[PDB]
From a paper:
CC-type chemokine ligand 5 ([name]) also known as RANTES (regulated on activation, normal T cell expressed and secreted) is expressed and produced by many types of cells including platelets, macrophages, eosinophils, fibroblasts, and epithelial cells. The molecule participates in a wide range of inflammatory disorders and pathologies. There are at least three phases for [name] oligomerization and aggregation that depend on pH, concentration, and temperature. By multiple sequence alignments of CCL5s from different animals, CCL5s conversely compose the sequence of F12-A13-Y14 (12FAY14).
Residue numbers in the entry:
A (entry chain A), B (entry chain A): 6 to 68
């Protein structure tokens, strides 16, 4: 917890074409999240347990 | 604060050869930090105002 962590997680989907990369936060966070990195390099915390996250991820991985 | 943030920041220097990338957290954090990404993809929060951070960074940028 000398590692970057997500207090909360984006309500609704961000636009799929704003998004270029993802990673998962440490599991040592209290809300471990997925993080989306936008073409503009904003890092956005998302709720991994949510359908739009899991098809965005599937989308970035089956490019 | 739907963006990944650093509660605290690594006391002492990490080994320079463990470190492959860096970025700065959002300025919207309460402790906005530098984050070091290790060859093993651990993200480590560091205090930007600290001499070892600023020559690690200079090191990754003058490669």
């Amino acid at each position: 917890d000398t590692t970057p962590c997500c207090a909360a997680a984006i309500a609704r989907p961000l636009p799929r074409a704003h998004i270029k990369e993802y990673f998962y936060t440490s599991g040592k966070c209290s809300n471990p999240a997925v993080v989306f990195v936008t073409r503009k390099n904003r890092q956005v915390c998302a709720n991994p347990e949510k359908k739009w996250v899991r098809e965005y991820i599937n989308s970035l991985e089956m490019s």
